[PDB]
Amino acid sequence: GRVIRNQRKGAGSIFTSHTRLRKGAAKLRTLDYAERHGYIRGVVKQIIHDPGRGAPLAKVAFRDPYKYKLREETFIANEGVYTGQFIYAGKKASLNVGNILPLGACPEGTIVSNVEEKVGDRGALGRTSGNYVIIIGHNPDENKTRVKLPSGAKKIISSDARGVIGVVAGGGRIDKPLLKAGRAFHKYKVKRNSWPKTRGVAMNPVDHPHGGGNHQHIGKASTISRGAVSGQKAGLIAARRTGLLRGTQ
Amino acid sequence: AQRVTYRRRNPYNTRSNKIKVVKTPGGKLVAQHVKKAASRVKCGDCGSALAGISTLRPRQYAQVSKTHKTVQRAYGGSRCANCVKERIVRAFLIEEQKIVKRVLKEQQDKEK
């Protein structure tokens, strides 16, 4: 047969992300002396739309502690953050929406976003619109914090990892139907080349494991082993179960 | 009516290939190539157009006198009047409160 559409994406010729209009990478500040020992104050200059992103971004200006210079940061805007607001980041920052605090400095039940998986990676968890991270508890002896991720998973993170207080702005986006193929076209025009999708069952046997037949049908189980190889992993990969989800999981 | 042609090799209606139609002293209708319209100098605080400053294409500011490019005030050609006024009042009031917070702190550094 032929190389299937799954495998052509790794080469990344026409499958790279369309990034001309993007407004910068959304990251926290580099963890420095001020954030480790006290707090540093910045001011929100802009709240802007980032193409390909549901969450708006905030442009926050900080002073450089060591040279006469202004540093502009690109944060993910939490809902309620406004232009001209003062943003405080550090160990001694107060528990206000938009402030960046270490996870150990936040009491249980604190809603936090753009949380660091590892100390200083500048934000990994809960970055999309309407999403957040809940702080479950602390383990001060081991310097660890328990959090709940938007997927429902419980994670143990260093208490020195940082997060931004509040919920990511732009939530409720999925509640409205797109209603049109053109709307999805414009949605993916600034994301990547993944739309529209032809069904593999509608192809020929060269194109896909599902192609061929005198009727459109998969022919074999569409649940594929985790240990299958590239060109085989088309369908439900390592599916623990199938069918309509009934009851609680 | 007389019809005109472009005066340059560019045949396309691009942003830099805009023309006007002008009648010459020879009684002819010719195309006159129009330079791109200048944009106004704007405030760095509020983004509004600054008054008293000439609207020129950026290289033309080098060849014009200084009175065209500035206003006789602090932040003259950079900030508008209202944004400078707000800076002055904010600087004065905030620094006044800095003294108040200092003397008050010294009041709690000798009795508590």
Next chain:
RNA sequence: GCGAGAGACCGAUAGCGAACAAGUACAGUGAUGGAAAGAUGAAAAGAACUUUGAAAAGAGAGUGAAAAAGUACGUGAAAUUG
């Protein structure tokens, strides 16, 4: 590659693709592909001159051993043709 001497070899549809302004003309976007084409006469002596014609040419003449050698050039087969 350079320099030589040879052959029971081929003799211009052969022998190298190329005996010649041949890796030329020409084709292809490109990698590449790639021909055809030698011979008047010892010597141009390559036909002065007259005449018919708009001219090309023709008819006389002239050169030559030969024009049954005139560059559409040694010989000049067959198909095909008057």
Next chain:
RNA sequence: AAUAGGGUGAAGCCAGAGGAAACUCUGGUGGAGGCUCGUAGCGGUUCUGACGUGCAAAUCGAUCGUCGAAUUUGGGUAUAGG
């Protein structure tokens, strides 16, 4: 970079009428939409028309689809033979 001229008439807004209230009705205004008729354009339904040693190794004529967007298109650029 390009895309006549019409039809329909969504929100929002103005005025009037009715009602105890919750609210309802009418006339305008407005100018929405992968809306619609229809040019340029893009496409290519049918005649199973012409042609079918063609004008053409896919064209010609009428008829037709669509025609403000998942639109059409120049140039630059990327992806290369299991």
Next chain:
RNA sequence: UGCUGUAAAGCUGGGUCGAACGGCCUCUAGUGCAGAUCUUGGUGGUAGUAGCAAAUAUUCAAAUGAGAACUUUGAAGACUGAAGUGGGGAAAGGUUCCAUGUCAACAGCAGUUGGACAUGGGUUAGUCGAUCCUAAGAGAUGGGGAAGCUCCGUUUCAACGUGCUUGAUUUUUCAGGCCAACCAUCGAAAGGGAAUCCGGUUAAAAUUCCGGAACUUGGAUAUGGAUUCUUCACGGCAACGUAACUGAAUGUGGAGACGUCGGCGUGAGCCCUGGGAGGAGUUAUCUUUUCUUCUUAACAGCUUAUCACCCUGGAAUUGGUUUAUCCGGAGAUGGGGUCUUAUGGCUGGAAGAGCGCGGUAAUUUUGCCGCGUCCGGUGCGCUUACGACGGUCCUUGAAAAUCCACAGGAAGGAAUAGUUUUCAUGCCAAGUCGUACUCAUAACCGCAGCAGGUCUCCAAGGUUAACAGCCUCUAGUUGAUAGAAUAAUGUA
């Protein structure tokens, strides 16, 4: 012309021809053709046959010539009908451009003509492009893979400046003061971007030449003005104004710099139209008539605006206000001002130019003279530019070079004199490459002068909703083998 042999063949007469060749005994082989849809070359019948029929359409005369359906000129009849059969360009071609000569071949008839053939001529730039910038991307270096051709990576685990700015020194040595996040390079003749216009001129070039009038950048540099004894100016309540009117490192901003649609407003060009001053046409009759000229560039000065802003004042009986309902104690309405100069007006440029007439010069290079070139109006008009608005998106609609302002306060500054080229005037320079022509029913690609394909700009009158269809003006073509007839069968 015959003879010999069963035969494969051998020999011979005549003609043609011009330089080598044969018999016999042996040797040797790339050694014998009717075929292989054989190979290469050549030639027939078909056959003077199929055919040379899309794109409305030609005709008379003269000239030229040996020769004219086809060339030239004149007269006419037509068509394209401004989304053109008009006038330019990008790609591509490459001399096809122009003049002269010229007809063997080519232009599927012809040819005196030609994009053919031959000989010459022709492309003029500081301002138009390239050049420079960065885009998607391409790609060296330090490194790391790979047997290697080379692959990855683009500042990457790097000691990465051929650094600058000054006071200089004339001691051709220096003294230092700042920084070195990022930063090789290539990548757009449609993106970004320093600066030019009008009139004239050639057989063929022109935003390039000539005449005149400007502008930008780089450099040098003096005078005037400005400023200083209160050293680095004044005025205005303010918005802010001006001829100027210090400002290092470093920093902050702005411009470059940005979708699309809708109606509205303003301008420009075009369309329409009145008077007057000219010219042409019609005139049996009518028509103070029909057509036409009456124009004004870049650049300089003054003035000119929606929006926005400032001062005054204090608002319900709410008012102002758009086609579109938004605004006002976060200060409306009212009154008075400030600003951007888009755009228009006046003046200079500039009437001296161009245009329209009339009168004269002459084989005549080329003219010379006189007069006029003026004053308006109109709009749901067309196109286009701009403006203030409004709608729209799970879509929010490049970058960089480059230029400016501001913050900062380093350093340097006067009185018998000091400073500055962001005020005026003056001086010098601007290199390299492209530039002709076609851009298509004949200059490109489809084997070709092929009904195909190939990006874009300008756009008159009537009818009309209309940039449709139909007719016409300017411009351009009248090209497509032709003649005679008009059966069948066609095609439309």
Next chain:
RNA sequence: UAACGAGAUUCCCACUGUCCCUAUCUACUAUCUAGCGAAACCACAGCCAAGGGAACGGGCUUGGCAGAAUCAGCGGGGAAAG
């Protein structure tokens, strides 16, 4: 299943040369001329009937017959060409 469809199908109104059943007209061909001038195809060729025969002959056998050179049409045959 409203709306939509150059999708497939049945019926009805309107409409008509689709038909009964054909006729007439126009232009361009065809046609004839001057000039220009291919190609497919071709063992040899080219009248029938029967016979036998590789069982459907242009040729063979037996008969019918049979008279130069040809033009426009035509599509039975050449088990026509590709």
Next chain:
RNA sequence: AAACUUUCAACAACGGAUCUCUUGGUUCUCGCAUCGAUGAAGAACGCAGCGAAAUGCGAUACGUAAUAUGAAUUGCAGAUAUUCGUGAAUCAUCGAAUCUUUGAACGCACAUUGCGCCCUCUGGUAUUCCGGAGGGCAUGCCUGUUUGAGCGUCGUUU
């Protein structure tokens, strides 16, 4: 009976076989060891009195010098060309030179005749700007020189 068709012969066509040639090819043998950063092989563009190509050459351009030789070259023309001679022609020979723009190709770049920087001289009233002439500036590696870096490290002095 003509015409027409077919056959044959003569002459003339069409065409280029046959014959005969041959500065070419092919194969065998013998001898030799010599490309390039001192810039090769290759490419592009030019160069002649009148040349398009081939051949030769490089702005010194169908060639300059030198050695040898000894009267040509030739299609035409023409010497401020030559003949008992420093003398015609000559890739005869060849030891000195020239050798455009390139190319491993070397300042950077190259779909550009694009853009720098350094030294000396020179023109424009110029250490700085503009013009011209000449000479330079690639990378890896080796030896050496100089200038450096690192509490890697030795000695000494508080």
Next chain:
RNA sequence: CUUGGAUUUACUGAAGACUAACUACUGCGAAAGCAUUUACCAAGGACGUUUUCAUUAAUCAAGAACGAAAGUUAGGGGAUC
């Protein structure tokens, strides 16, 4: 379901519901309904009144608000039944 240690035992944790006993011929609300603590928000009946207004009222076709459980649509939760 259980020798792979079930059931049982102690400690710890997480989820959702639900508010026992107190709880009654007791309370509140227009009805449906309402039961852990505290805070906040706005209501309400009765009582008291030598306050106030003076007929403003009763019931009501049309028309409205609320309306157990089950059920429907879309998110979230889904312990127990």
